[PDB]
């Protein structure tokens, strides 16, 4: 089964949910966590 | 038989069809408490690091 889509941990083709959703959610979480941290520490210290 | 079971266990660890860490009929006694208590040790430090972010102390 050695081939061009065999060394990757995630499945890319012949998949039920298309690959755009797992590709987008990875970057969405990666650029959304450090705004959540700032929101929590702002709300714990009085300011809006 | 004698203390030279070395020439007997070397015909067992070869041709086993199981992994090395679970091949002998003694590895149950080592592997059941370890994996049992590890799932409590990890599940206790994910409850006290989420309770503590909300300000709750003991």
């Amino acid at each position: 089964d050695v081939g061009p889509y065999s060394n990757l941990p995630f499945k890319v083709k012949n998949r039920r949910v298309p690959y755009a959703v797992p590709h987008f959610l990875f970057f969405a979480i990666g650029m959304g966590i450090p705004f959540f941290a700032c929101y929590v520490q702002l709300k714990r210290s009085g300011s809006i | 038989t004698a203390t030279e079971k070395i020439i007997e266990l070397q015909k067992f660890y070869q041709s086993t069809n199981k992994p090395i860490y679970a091949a002998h009929p003694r590895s149950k006694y080592y592997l059941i408490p370890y994996f049992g208590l590890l799932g409590v040790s990890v599940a206790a430090t994910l409850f006290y690091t989420g309770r503590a972010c909300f300000g709750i102390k003991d």
């Binding site: 060394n7 990757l8 702002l42 | -």
Partner: protein, 535 residues
């Protein structure tokens, strides 16, 4: 069960490099959004986004330092390019201690959790990246934040030590039949010379951090001056780690550039023995200087004169490497593909960022530049434009071989030009702000420093767009990547010569100087059954 025994319980060295890449991408996204938070606050005078909180500004700066000194550049330059390429270049099947490679990967996700949990249970850890003793005590930071942040610098230290011992032990006795240790490629020498500094530097950091912990929580008073200690000792015990560290980030970059300069300009490298001796000299003279970070603490007058002399000497070996790269690029034929664009943008910007280091080396001139934005502008031209550019060049060089899927050339060029323009807009007026007198680590500034802060907030929004375009380049590589090899001739590793016909070239396509580009391109799981032969 086959998923678990092959991507969680692993032995293969090349299958941990892909996990290192996936981790490094995430930990380089988080810090870049944290940097965008900082640069959107330092835009105009006043209190704009963080309402009045000067905490959650220092926390963001600390967590942006740690996530890209320890969690992005080192996992990419050690895990993805060192674990994958070094066995294939020296000709070995796998590493010597494979389970230590697996633990050196898996110590890092527990190090991310403690750092992200050092910014939610309390005010936070706003001590800066250098966790100085009398601020990080129990009178300013009294909570489980600094403690959980100095436990994230232990696990990374253990991982780096265990990786370095593996790298040194592998290259000594796991070579092929006809390689002595003078026919090795230059990347293996770069990994060896960074792995020796990882042995010789990390115990001092571990000792200093542990003594800081004992001062905080077991009332020991190593660094408290009410019991007979000095804070300055910690500075020694920090910076003896600090200056080896910043060569650990840059030596694996250099060798990568050499390969690109050897490839897309069809000439061998000018003076390879001089290059390995130059890397050895740079590695040795990074341990005998550490106190140029501390000229204002009150040292002697005969000790500053030693550290000005021992700092400017390091310019002599680096010039040999730069001029040898110019001599390699001089005579040959040059085709401008997307690795050589990043290669050409590295030989100019490392020089500009490194010539500022000679101005800061003098103890007389450091009185005007210490804790000032000139230092920040100095080390961002070398960190963001010297290491990240080498990482992008290495990715665009070795990704078709590892993955087997090609990429669109035009979008990669647009990404490169956006990075170039935005990053040169961002870090250049920091020199002017430094020369006029703006200090470091301040949220709010006097109204005179406004205008340049309006311009350096504009390039960051250019660079984030380049990161998003890089994400789309990866997506276009993974989907329909088999059909992206006939669009452009960039997919060819080497071009036909003048006399070499096309019919002859299609029979004999790959000409190389390493084992790397002659493999089948997915590399096989067990890639060497019979040994390789070198004369």
């Amino acid at each position: 069960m086959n998923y678990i025994n092959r991507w969680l319980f692993s032995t293969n060295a090349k299958d941990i490099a892909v996990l290192y890449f996936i981790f490094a991408l995430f930990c380089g996204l988080l810090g870049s959004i944290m940097s965008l938070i900082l640069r959107l606050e330092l835009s105009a005078p006043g209190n704009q986004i963080l309402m009045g909180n000067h905490q959650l500004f220092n926390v963001v700066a600390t967590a942006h330092a740690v996530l890209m000194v320890f969690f992005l550049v080192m996992p990419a330059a050690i895990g993805f390019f060192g674990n994958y390429l070094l066995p294939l270049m020296i000709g070995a099947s796998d590493m010597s201690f494979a389970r230590l490679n697996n633990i050196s990967f898996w110590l890092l996700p527990p190090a991310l959790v403690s750092l992200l949990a050092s910014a939610l249970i309390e005010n936070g850890a706003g001590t800066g990246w250098t966790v100085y003793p009398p601020l990080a005590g129990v009178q300013s930071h009294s909570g489980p934040s600094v403690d959980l942040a100095i436990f994230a610098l232990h696990l990374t230290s253990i991982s780096s030590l265990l990786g370095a011992i593996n790298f040194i032990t592998t290259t000594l006795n796991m070579r092929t039949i006809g390689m002595t240790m003078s026919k090795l490629p230059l990347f293996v020498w770069a990994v060896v010379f960074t792995s020796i500094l990882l042995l010789l530097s990390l115990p001092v950091l571990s000792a200093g951090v542990t003594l800081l912990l004992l001062d905080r929580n077991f009332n020991t008073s190593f660094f408290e001056p009410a019991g007979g200690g000095d804070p300055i000792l910690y500075q020694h015990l920090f910076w003896f780690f600090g200056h080896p560290e910043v060569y650990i980030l840059i030596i694996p970059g250099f060798g990568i550039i050499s390969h690109i300069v050897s490839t897309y300009s069809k000439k061998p490298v000018f003076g390879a023995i001089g290059m390995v001796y130059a890397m050895g000299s740079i590695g040795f003279l990074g341990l005998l200087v550490w106190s140029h970070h501390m000229y204002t603490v009150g040292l002697d007058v005969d000790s500053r004169a030693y550290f000005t002399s021992a700092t400017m000497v390091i310019a002599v070996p680096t010039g040999i490497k730069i001029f040898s790269w110019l001599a390699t690029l001089y005579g040959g034929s040059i085709r401008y593909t997307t690795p050589m664009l990043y290669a050409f943008a590295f030989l100019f910007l490392f020089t500009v960022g490194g010539l500022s280091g000679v101005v800061l080396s003098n103890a007389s001139l450091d009185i005007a530049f210490h804790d000032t934005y000139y230092v920040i502008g100095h080390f961002h031209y070398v960190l963001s434009l010297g290491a990240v550019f080498s990482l992008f060049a290495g990715y665009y060089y070795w990704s078709p071989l590892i993955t087997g899927l090609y990429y669109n050339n035009n979008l990669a060029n647009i990404q490169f030009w956006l990075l170039f323009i935005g990053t040169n807009v961002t870090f250049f007026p920091m020199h002017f702000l430094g020369l006029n007198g703006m200090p470091r680590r301040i949220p709010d500034y006097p109204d005179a420093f406004a205008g340049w802060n309006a311009i350096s907030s504009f390039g960051s929004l250019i660079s984030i767009i380049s990161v998003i375009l890089f994400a789309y380049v990866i997506y276009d590589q993974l989907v329909n990547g088999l059909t992206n090899k006939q669009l452009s001739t960039n997919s060819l590793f080497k071009n036909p010569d003048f006399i070499e016909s096309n019919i002859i070239f299609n029979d004999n396509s790959i000409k190389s100087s390493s084992i790397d580009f002659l493999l089948t391109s997915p590399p096989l799981p067990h890639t060497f059954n019979t040994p390789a032969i070198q004369s």
